[PDB]
Amino acid sequence: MEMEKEFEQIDKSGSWAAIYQDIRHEASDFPSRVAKLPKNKNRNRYRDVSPFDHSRIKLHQEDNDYINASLIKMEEAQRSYILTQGPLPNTVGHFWEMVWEQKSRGVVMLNRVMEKGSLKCAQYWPQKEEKEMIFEDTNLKLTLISEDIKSYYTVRQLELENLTTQETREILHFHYTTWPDFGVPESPASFLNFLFKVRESGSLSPEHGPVVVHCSAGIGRSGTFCLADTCLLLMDKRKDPSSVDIKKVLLEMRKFRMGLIQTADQLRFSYLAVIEGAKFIMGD
Ligand SMILES: CC(=O)c1ccccc1Sc1ccccc1C(=O)O
Incomplete structure:
Protein backbone atom coordinates (compact mmCIF):
# COMPACT_ATOMS: atom_id res chain seq x y z
CA MET A 1 0.00 0.00 0.00
CA GLU A 2 1.43 3.45 -1.10
CA MET A 3 2.39 4.95 2.33
CA GLU A 4 0.84 8.35 1.17
CA LYS A 5 -2.64 6.63 1.12
CA GLU A 6 -1.98 4.60 4.32
CA PHE A 7 -1.03 8.09 5.77
CA GLU A 8 -4.35 9.83 4.79
CA GLN A 9 -6.35 6.72 5.98
CA ILE A 10 -4.66 6.77 9.50
CA ASP A 11 -5.04 10.62 9.62
CA LYS A 12 -8.78 10.67 8.70
CA SER A 13 -9.43 7.79 11.21
CA GLY A 14 -7.19 9.42 13.92
CA SER A 15 -5.54 6.00 14.68
CA TRP A 16 -1.82 7.06 15.08
CA ALA A 17 -1.84 6.06 18.82
CA ALA A 18 -3.25 2.60 17.82
CA ILE A 19 -0.66 1.98 14.98
CA TYR A 20 2.13 3.06 17.45
CA GLN A 21 1.01 0.61 20.23
CA ASP A 22 0.92 -2.24 17.60
CA ILE A 23 4.66 -1.54 16.91
CA ARG A 24 5.42 -1.41 20.68
CA HIS A 25 3.62 -4.81 21.06
CA GLU A 26 5.51 -6.62 18.18
CA ALA A 27 8.95 -5.07 19.03
CA SER A 28 11.91 -7.43 19.79
CA ASP A 29 12.95 -8.04 23.44
CA PHE A 30 16.60 -9.16 23.86
CA PRO A 31 18.74 -9.25 27.02
CA SER A 32 20.73 -6.13 28.25
CA ARG A 33 22.75 -7.86 31.01
CA VAL A 34 26.05 -5.91 30.62
CA ALA A 35 24.17 -2.51 30.82
CA LYS A 36 22.54 -3.55 34.16
CA LEU A 37 25.78 -4.63 35.95
CA PRO A 38 26.36 -2.50 39.10
CA LYS A 39 29.82 -1.30 37.87
CA ASN A 40 27.97 0.41 34.87
CA LYS A 41 25.27 2.32 36.77
CA ASN A 42 26.97 5.76 36.29
CA ARG A 43 27.51 4.99 32.49
CA ASN A 44 23.70 5.11 31.83
CA ARG A 45 21.70 8.34 31.58
CA TYR A 46 18.26 6.62 31.85
CA ARG A 47 17.45 3.42 33.85
CA ASP A 48 14.88 2.23 31.19
CA VAL A 49 17.13 2.81 28.06
CA SER A 50 19.86 0.17 27.53
CA PRO A 51 21.71 -1.39 24.61
CA PHE A 52 21.00 -5.12 23.88
CA ASP A 53 24.06 -7.36 24.56
CA HIS A 54 24.13 -8.75 20.95
CA SER A 55 24.38 -5.28 19.20
CA ARG A 56 26.25 -3.17 21.87
CA ILE A 57 29.45 -1.28 20.88
CA LYS A 58 32.48 -2.57 22.86
CA LEU A 59 35.27 -0.14 23.90
CA HIS A 60 38.78 -1.63 23.11
CA GLN A 61 40.03 -1.75 26.73
CA GLU A 62 40.34 -4.66 29.24
CA ASP A 63 39.25 -2.46 32.25
CA ASN A 64 35.53 -1.90 31.33
CA ASP A 65 34.37 -2.21 27.66
CA TYR A 66 30.85 -0.76 28.33
CA ILE A 67 29.18 2.29 26.62
CA ASN A 68 25.43 2.91 26.13
CA ALA A 69 25.67 2.59 22.27
CA SER A 70 24.19 0.13 19.63
CA LEU A 71 25.18 -0.86 16.03
CA THR A 91 31.51 9.19 29.66
CA VAL A 92 32.81 12.07 27.42
CA GLY A 93 36.22 10.32 27.13
CA HIS A 94 34.47 6.93 26.28
CA PHE A 95 32.36 8.71 23.58
CA TRP A 96 35.47 10.00 21.71
CA GLU A 97 37.29 6.62 22.21
CA MET A 98 34.32 4.96 20.42
CA VAL A 99 34.40 7.54 17.55
CA TRP A 100 38.16 6.78 17.17
CA GLU A 101 37.95 2.93 17.43
CA GLN A 102 34.93 2.67 15.04
CA LYS A 103 36.51 5.06 12.40
CA SER A 104 33.39 7.36 12.19
CA ARG A 105 33.63 10.51 9.93
CA GLY A 106 30.43 12.14 11.30
CA VAL A 107 28.68 12.82 14.66
CA VAL A 108 24.95 13.83 14.26
CA MET A 109 23.50 15.69 17.35
CA LEU A 110 19.70 16.25 17.43
CA ASN A 111 19.30 17.98 20.85
CA ARG A 112 20.49 21.18 22.63
CA VAL A 113 22.77 20.87 25.72
CA MET A 114 19.89 22.43 27.78
CA GLU A 115 16.17 21.81 26.97
CA LYS A 116 13.10 22.45 29.17
CA GLY A 117 15.52 24.06 31.73
CA SER A 118 17.54 20.78 32.38
CA LEU A 119 20.88 19.39 31.05
CA LYS A 120 20.21 16.78 28.29
CA CYS A 121 23.95 16.07 27.61
CA ALA A 122 27.49 17.19 28.59
CA GLN A 123 29.33 19.97 26.67
CA TYR A 124 31.55 17.28 24.97
CA TRP A 125 33.20 19.48 22.21
CA PRO A 126 35.30 22.72 22.42
CA GLN A 127 33.47 26.07 21.84
CA LYS A 128 36.67 28.06 20.97
CA GLU A 129 39.54 27.27 18.54
CA GLU A 130 42.19 28.25 21.18
CA LYS A 131 40.65 26.17 24.08
CA GLU A 132 41.13 22.50 23.08
CA MET A 133 39.93 19.54 25.26
CA ILE A 134 42.11 16.70 26.62
CA PHE A 135 40.44 13.42 27.78
CA GLU A 136 43.06 11.98 30.17
CA ASP A 148 29.41 27.31 10.25
CA ILE A 149 26.18 28.56 11.99
CA LYS A 150 22.96 28.48 9.85
CA SER A 151 19.31 29.14 10.83
CA TYR A 152 18.30 25.46 11.44
CA TYR A 153 21.71 23.79 12.11
CA THR A 154 25.47 24.30 12.78
CA VAL A 155 28.31 22.26 11.11
CA ARG A 156 31.68 22.04 12.91
CA GLN A 157 35.09 20.70 11.77
CA LEU A 158 36.94 19.00 14.68
CA GLU A 159 40.39 17.47 14.87
CA LEU A 160 40.67 14.21 16.92
CA GLU A 161 44.27 13.26 17.94
CA ASN A 162 45.17 9.88 19.46
CA LEU A 163 47.85 11.18 21.93
CA THR A 164 49.29 7.60 22.11
CA THR A 165 50.31 7.45 18.35
CA GLN A 166 49.98 11.13 17.25
CA GLU A 167 47.61 9.99 14.41
CA THR A 168 45.08 12.74 13.34
CA ARG A 169 41.59 12.76 11.66
CA GLU A 170 39.01 15.48 10.79
CA ILE A 171 35.53 14.68 12.28
CA LEU A 172 32.39 16.58 11.11
CA HIS A 173 29.81 17.59 13.84
CA PHE A 174 26.26 18.11 12.42
CA HIS A 175 24.12 19.83 15.11
CA TYR A 176 20.35 20.17 14.47
CA THR A 177 19.57 23.07 16.83
CA THR A 178 15.70 23.45 16.74
CA TRP A 179 14.01 20.06 17.67
CA PRO A 180 11.82 20.12 20.85
CA ASP A 181 11.98 17.25 23.44
CA PHE A 182 9.44 14.52 22.42
CA GLY A 183 8.52 17.20 19.80
CA VAL A 184 8.60 16.97 15.95
CA PRO A 185 11.29 18.78 13.87
CA GLU A 186 8.90 21.51 12.60
CA SER A 187 7.98 20.47 8.98
CA PRO A 188 9.73 17.89 6.75
CA ALA A 189 11.64 20.73 4.93
CA SER A 190 14.32 21.74 7.55
CA PHE A 191 14.83 18.09 8.77
CA LEU A 192 15.28 16.76 5.17
CA ASN A 193 17.55 19.73 4.29
CA PHE A 194 19.73 18.71 7.34
CA LEU A 195 19.70 14.97 6.35
CA PHE A 196 20.91 15.83 2.77
CA LYS A 197 23.79 17.98 4.23
CA VAL A 198 24.97 14.95 6.33
CA ARG A 199 24.75 12.69 3.17
CA GLU A 200 26.74 15.18 0.97
CA SER A 201 29.58 15.27 3.60
CA GLY A 202 30.49 11.56 2.96
CA SER A 203 29.70 10.84 6.69
CA LEU A 204 27.08 8.07 5.82
CA SER A 205 29.20 6.34 3.10
CA PRO A 206 30.72 2.82 3.24
CA GLU A 207 34.35 4.02 2.90
CA PHE A 225 16.79 10.32 11.54
CA VAL A 244 8.86 0.32 1.15
CA ASP A 245 6.91 -0.52 4.37
CA ILE A 246 7.99 2.09 7.00
CA LYS A 247 6.45 0.00 9.92
CA LYS A 248 8.49 -3.07 8.80
CA VAL A 249 11.75 -1.06 8.51
CA LEU A 250 11.10 0.33 12.07
CA LEU A 251 10.57 -3.19 13.53
CA LEU A 267 5.85 8.04 13.91
CA ARG A 268 3.53 10.44 11.95
CA PHE A 269 6.44 12.93 11.37
CA SER A 270 8.66 9.99 10.06
CA TYR A 271 5.93 9.22 7.46
CA LEU A 272 5.73 12.94 6.42
CA ALA A 273 9.54 13.19 6.04
CA VAL A 274 9.73 10.00 3.84
CA ILE A 275 6.70 11.02 1.67
CA GLU A 276 8.04 14.60 1.09
CA GLY A 277 11.66 13.36 0.58
CA ALA A 278 10.52 10.79 -2.06
CA LYS A 279 9.41 13.78 -4.26
CA PHE A 280 13.27 14.31 -4.71
CA ILE A 281 14.42 10.58 -4.88
CA MET A 282 11.91 10.02 -7.78
CA GLY A 283 13.73 12.57 -10.01
CA ASP A 284 12.52 16.08 -9.09
C1 LIG B 1 42.11 8.63 8.59
C2 LIG B 1 40.92 9.01 7.71
O1 LIG B 1 41.07 9.10 6.52
C3 LIG B 1 39.60 9.26 8.35
C4 LIG B 1 38.86 8.13 8.78
C5 LIG B 1 37.62 8.27 9.42
C6 LIG B 1 37.10 9.54 9.62
C7 LIG B 1 37.83 10.66 9.19
C8 LIG B 1 39.08 10.56 8.56
S1 LIG B 1 39.94 12.06 8.04
C9 LIG B 1 39.23 12.76 6.54
C10 LIG B 1 38.19 12.07 5.89
C11 LIG B 1 37.59 12.56 4.72
C12 LIG B 1 38.03 13.77 4.18
C13 LIG B 1 39.06 14.45 4.81
C14 LIG B 1 39.68 13.97 5.99
C15 LIG B 1 40.81 14.81 6.63
O2 LIG B 1 41.66 14.17 7.29
O3 LIG B 1 40.78 16.05 6.45
Whole structure:
Protein backbone atom coordinates (compact mmCIF):
# COMPACT_ATOMS: atom_id res chain seq x y z
CA MET A 1 0.00 0.00 0.00
CA GLU A 2 1.43 3.45 -1.10
CA MET A 3 2.39 4.95 2.33
CA GLU A 4 0.84 8.35 1.17
CA LYS A 5 -2.64 6.63 1.12
CA GLU A 6 -1.98 4.60 4.32
CA PHE A 7 -1.03 8.09 5.77
CA GLU A 8 -4.35 9.83 4.79
CA GLN A 9 -6.35 6.72 5.98
CA ILE A 10 -4.66 6.77 9.50
CA ASP A 11 -5.04 10.62 9.62
CA LYS A 12 -8.78 10.67 8.70
CA SER A 13 -9.43 7.79 11.21
CA GLY A 14 -7.19 9.42 13.92
CA SER A 15 -5.54 6.00 14.68
CA TRP A 16 -1.82 7.06 15.08
CA ALA A 17 -1.84 6.06 18.82
CA ALA A 18 -3.25 2.60 17.82
CA ILE A 19 -0.66 1.98 14.98
CA TYR A 20 2.13 3.06 17.45
CA GLN A 21 1.01 0.61 20.23
CA ASP A 22 0.92 -2.24 17.60
CA ILE A 23 4.66 -1.54 16.91
CA ARG A 24 5.42 -1.41 20.68
CA HIS A 25 3.62 -4.81 21.06
CA GLU A 26 5.51 -6.62 18.18
CA ALA A 27 8.95 -5.07 19.03
CA SER A 28 11.91 -7.43 19.79
CA ASP A 29 12.95 -8.04 23.44
CA PHE A 30 16.60 -9.16 23.86
CA PRO A 31 18.74 -9.25 27.02
CA SER A 32 20.73 -6.13 28.25
CA ARG A 33 22.75 -7.86 31.01
CA VAL A 34 26.05 -5.91 30.62
CA ALA A 35 24.17 -2.51 30.82
CA LYS A 36 22.54 -3.55 34.16
CA LEU A 37 25.78 -4.63 35.95
CA PRO A 38 26.36 -2.50 39.10
CA LYS A 39 29.82 -1.30 37.87
CA ASN A 40 27.97 0.41 34.87
CA LYS A 41 25.27 2.32 36.77
CA ASN A 42 26.97 5.76 36.29
CA ARG A 43 27.51 4.99 32.49
CA ASN A 44 23.70 5.11 31.83
CA ARG A 45 21.70 8.34 31.58
CA TYR A 46 18.26 6.62 31.85
CA ARG A 47 17.45 3.42 33.85
CA ASP A 48 14.88 2.23 31.19
CA VAL A 49 17.13 2.81 28.06
CA SER A 50 19.86 0.17 27.53
CA PRO A 51 21.71 -1.39 24.61
CA PHE A 52 21.00 -5.12 23.88
CA ASP A 53 24.06 -7.36 24.56
CA HIS A 54 24.13 -8.75 20.95
CA SER A 55 24.38 -5.28 19.20
CA ARG A 56 26.25 -3.17 21.87
CA ILE A 57 29.45 -1.28 20.88
CA LYS A 58 32.48 -2.57 22.86
CA LEU A 59 35.27 -0.14 23.90
CA HIS A 60 38.78 -1.63 23.11
CA GLN A 61 40.03 -1.75 26.73
CA GLU A 62 40.34 -4.66 29.24
CA ASP A 63 39.25 -2.46 32.25
CA ASN A 64 35.53 -1.90 31.33
CA ASP A 65 34.37 -2.21 27.66
CA TYR A 66 30.85 -0.76 28.33
CA ILE A 67 29.18 2.29 26.62
CA ASN A 68 25.43 2.91 26.13
CA ALA A 69 25.67 2.59 22.27
CA SER A 70 24.19 0.13 19.63
CA LEU A 71 25.18 -0.86 16.03
CA ILE A 72 22.08 -0.70 13.78
CA LYS A 73 23.13 -2.77 10.63
CA MET A 74 20.57 -2.38 7.73
CA GLU A 75 21.50 -5.26 5.38
CA GLU A 76 19.31 -4.51 2.26
CA ALA A 77 19.97 -0.69 2.39
CA GLN A 78 23.75 -1.33 2.96
CA ARG A 79 23.84 1.37 5.75
CA SER A 80 25.09 1.07 9.38
CA TYR A 81 24.48 3.62 12.23
CA ILE A 82 25.72 3.81 15.86
CA LEU A 83 22.89 5.19 18.06
CA THR A 84 24.04 6.40 21.53
CA GLN A 85 22.83 8.49 24.48
CA GLY A 86 24.00 12.10 24.99
CA PRO A 87 27.34 11.71 26.81
CA LEU A 88 27.58 12.11 30.60
CA PRO A 89 30.27 14.11 32.47
CA ASN A 90 32.01 10.78 33.21
CA THR A 91 31.51 9.19 29.66
CA VAL A 92 32.81 12.07 27.42
CA GLY A 93 36.22 10.32 27.13
CA HIS A 94 34.47 6.93 26.28
CA PHE A 95 32.36 8.71 23.58
CA TRP A 96 35.47 10.00 21.71
CA GLU A 97 37.29 6.62 22.21
CA MET A 98 34.32 4.96 20.42
CA VAL A 99 34.40 7.54 17.55
CA TRP A 100 38.16 6.78 17.17
CA GLU A 101 37.95 2.93 17.43
CA GLN A 102 34.93 2.67 15.04
CA LYS A 103 36.51 5.06 12.40
CA SER A 104 33.39 7.36 12.19
CA ARG A 105 33.63 10.51 9.93
CA GLY A 106 30.43 12.14 11.30
CA VAL A 107 28.68 12.82 14.66
CA VAL A 108 24.95 13.83 14.26
CA MET A 109 23.50 15.69 17.35
CA LEU A 110 19.70 16.25 17.43
CA ASN A 111 19.30 17.98 20.85
CA ARG A 112 20.49 21.18 22.63
CA VAL A 113 22.77 20.87 25.72
CA MET A 114 19.89 22.43 27.78
CA GLU A 115 16.17 21.81 26.97
CA LYS A 116 13.10 22.45 29.17
CA GLY A 117 15.52 24.06 31.73
CA SER A 118 17.54 20.78 32.38
CA LEU A 119 20.88 19.39 31.05
CA LYS A 120 20.21 16.78 28.29
CA CYS A 121 23.95 16.07 27.61
CA ALA A 122 27.49 17.19 28.59
CA GLN A 123 29.33 19.97 26.67
CA TYR A 124 31.55 17.28 24.97
CA TRP A 125 33.20 19.48 22.21
CA PRO A 126 35.30 22.72 22.42
CA GLN A 127 33.47 26.07 21.84
CA LYS A 128 36.67 28.06 20.97
CA GLU A 129 39.54 27.27 18.54
CA GLU A 130 42.19 28.25 21.18
CA LYS A 131 40.65 26.17 24.08
CA GLU A 132 41.13 22.50 23.08
CA MET A 133 39.93 19.54 25.26
CA ILE A 134 42.11 16.70 26.62
CA PHE A 135 40.44 13.42 27.78
CA GLU A 136 43.06 11.98 30.17
CA ASP A 137 41.21 8.65 30.84
CA THR A 138 41.27 7.73 27.04
CA ASN A 139 44.42 9.74 25.96
CA LEU A 140 42.66 11.85 23.21
CA LYS A 141 42.83 15.58 22.24
CA LEU A 142 39.95 17.42 20.53
CA THR A 143 40.29 20.87 18.78
CA LEU A 144 37.62 23.06 17.15
CA ILE A 145 38.93 23.82 13.57
CA SER A 146 35.92 25.79 12.21
CA GLU A 147 32.20 26.45 12.81
CA ASP A 148 29.41 27.31 10.25
CA ILE A 149 26.18 28.56 11.99
CA LYS A 150 22.96 28.48 9.85
CA SER A 151 19.31 29.14 10.83
CA TYR A 152 18.30 25.46 11.44
CA TYR A 153 21.71 23.79 12.11
CA THR A 154 25.47 24.30 12.78
CA VAL A 155 28.31 22.26 11.11
CA ARG A 156 31.68 22.04 12.91
CA GLN A 157 35.09 20.70 11.77
CA LEU A 158 36.94 19.00 14.68
CA GLU A 159 40.39 17.47 14.87
CA LEU A 160 40.67 14.21 16.92
CA GLU A 161 44.27 13.26 17.94
CA ASN A 162 45.17 9.88 19.46
CA LEU A 163 47.85 11.18 21.93
CA THR A 164 49.29 7.60 22.11
CA THR A 165 50.31 7.45 18.35
CA GLN A 166 49.98 11.13 17.25
CA GLU A 167 47.61 9.99 14.41
CA THR A 168 45.08 12.74 13.34
CA ARG A 169 41.59 12.76 11.66
CA GLU A 170 39.01 15.48 10.79
CA ILE A 171 35.53 14.68 12.28
CA LEU A 172 32.39 16.58 11.11
CA HIS A 173 29.81 17.59 13.84
CA PHE A 174 26.26 18.11 12.42
CA HIS A 175 24.12 19.83 15.11
CA TYR A 176 20.35 20.17 14.47
CA THR A 177 19.57 23.07 16.83
CA THR A 178 15.70 23.45 16.74
CA TRP A 179 14.01 20.06 17.67
CA PRO A 180 11.82 20.12 20.85
CA ASP A 181 11.98 17.25 23.44
CA PHE A 182 9.44 14.52 22.42
CA GLY A 183 8.52 17.20 19.80
CA VAL A 184 8.60 16.97 15.95
CA PRO A 185 11.29 18.78 13.87
CA GLU A 186 8.90 21.51 12.60
CA SER A 187 7.98 20.47 8.98
CA PRO A 188 9.73 17.89 6.75
CA ALA A 189 11.64 20.73 4.93
CA SER A 190 14.32 21.74 7.55
CA PHE A 191 14.83 18.09 8.77
CA LEU A 192 15.28 16.76 5.17
CA ASN A 193 17.55 19.73 4.29
CA PHE A 194 19.73 18.71 7.34
CA LEU A 195 19.70 14.97 6.35
CA PHE A 196 20.91 15.83 2.77
CA LYS A 197 23.79 17.98 4.23
CA VAL A 198 24.97 14.95 6.33
CA ARG A 199 24.75 12.69 3.17
CA GLU A 200 26.74 15.18 0.97
CA SER A 201 29.58 15.27 3.60
CA GLY A 202 30.49 11.56 2.96
CA SER A 203 29.70 10.84 6.69
CA LEU A 204 27.08 8.07 5.82
CA SER A 205 29.20 6.34 3.10
CA PRO A 206 30.72 2.82 3.24
CA GLU A 207 34.35 4.02 2.90
CA HIS A 208 33.90 5.32 6.52
CA GLY A 209 32.97 3.56 9.80
CA PRO A 210 29.32 4.09 10.90
CA VAL A 211 27.98 7.63 11.66
CA VAL A 212 27.42 8.25 15.43
CA VAL A 213 23.89 9.61 16.06
CA HIS A 214 22.54 10.89 19.44
CA CYS A 215 19.80 12.93 21.15
CA SER A 216 19.30 12.71 24.96
CA ALA A 217 18.36 8.96 25.25
CA GLY A 218 19.42 8.00 21.65
CA ILE A 219 16.00 6.44 20.63
CA GLY A 220 13.43 9.19 19.80
CA ARG A 221 14.81 11.90 17.47
CA SER A 222 17.80 9.57 16.71
CA GLY A 223 15.28 6.89 15.60
CA THR A 224 13.50 9.40 13.29
CA PHE A 225 16.79 10.32 11.54
CA CYS A 226 17.96 6.73 10.69
CA LEU A 227 14.38 5.46 9.78
CA ALA A 228 13.91 8.36 7.30
CA ASP A 229 17.44 7.90 5.77
CA THR A 230 17.02 4.06 5.33
CA CYS A 231 13.43 4.22 3.83
CA LEU A 232 14.57 6.88 1.25
CA LEU A 233 17.66 4.74 0.36
CA LEU A 234 15.44 1.60 -0.16
CA MET A 235 13.15 3.64 -2.54
CA ASP A 236 16.39 4.53 -4.50
CA LYS A 237 18.29 1.15 -4.51
CA ARG A 238 15.30 -0.36 -6.44
CA LYS A 239 13.69 2.98 -7.62
CA ASP A 240 10.33 1.22 -6.83
CA PRO A 241 8.84 3.60 -4.19
CA SER A 242 5.79 1.31 -3.42
CA SER A 243 8.18 -1.52 -2.21
CA VAL A 244 8.86 0.32 1.15
CA ASP A 245 6.91 -0.52 4.37
CA ILE A 246 7.99 2.09 7.00
CA LYS A 247 6.45 0.00 9.92
CA LYS A 248 8.49 -3.07 8.80
CA VAL A 249 11.75 -1.06 8.51
CA LEU A 250 11.10 0.33 12.07
CA LEU A 251 10.57 -3.19 13.53
CA GLU A 252 13.79 -4.37 11.74
CA MET A 253 15.72 -1.40 13.32
CA ARG A 254 14.19 -2.25 16.76
CA LYS A 255 15.96 -5.68 16.66
CA PHE A 256 19.20 -3.64 17.27
CA ARG A 257 18.09 -0.98 19.88
CA MET A 258 14.91 -0.73 22.05
CA GLY A 259 12.34 2.09 21.89
CA LEU A 260 13.26 3.70 18.52
CA ILE A 261 10.55 6.35 17.84
CA GLN A 262 9.22 7.40 21.31
CA THR A 263 5.74 8.85 20.42
CA ALA A 264 2.87 8.48 17.91
CA ASP A 265 3.69 12.10 16.71
CA GLN A 266 7.35 11.00 15.95
CA LEU A 267 5.85 8.04 13.91
CA ARG A 268 3.53 10.44 11.95
CA PHE A 269 6.44 12.93 11.37
CA SER A 270 8.66 9.99 10.06
CA TYR A 271 5.93 9.22 7.46
CA LEU A 272 5.73 12.94 6.42
CA ALA A 273 9.54 13.19 6.04
CA VAL A 274 9.73 10.00 3.84
CA ILE A 275 6.70 11.02 1.67
CA GLU A 276 8.04 14.60 1.09
CA GLY A 277 11.66 13.36 0.58
CA ALA A 278 10.52 10.79 -2.06
CA LYS A 279 9.41 13.78 -4.26
CA PHE A 280 13.27 14.31 -4.71
CA ILE A 281 14.42 10.58 -4.88
CA MET A 282 11.91 10.02 -7.78
CA GLY A 283 13.73 12.57 -10.01
CA ASP A 284 12.52 16.08 -9.09
C1 LIG B 1 42.11 8.63 8.59
C2 LIG B 1 40.92 9.01 7.71
O1 LIG B 1 41.07 9.10 6.52
C3 LIG B 1 39.60 9.26 8.35
C4 LIG B 1 38.86 8.13 8.78
C5 LIG B 1 37.62 8.27 9.42
C6 LIG B 1 37.10 9.54 9.62
C7 LIG B 1 37.83 10.66 9.19
C8 LIG B 1 39.08 10.56 8.56
S1 LIG B 1 39.94 12.06 8.04
C9 LIG B 1 39.23 12.76 6.54
C10 LIG B 1 38.19 12.07 5.89
C11 LIG B 1 37.59 12.56 4.72
C12 LIG B 1 38.03 13.77 4.18
C13 LIG B 1 39.06 14.45 4.81
C14 LIG B 1 39.68 13.97 5.99
C15 LIG B 1 40.81 14.81 6.63
O2 LIG B 1 41.66 14.17 7.29
O3 LIG B 1 40.78 16.05 6.45
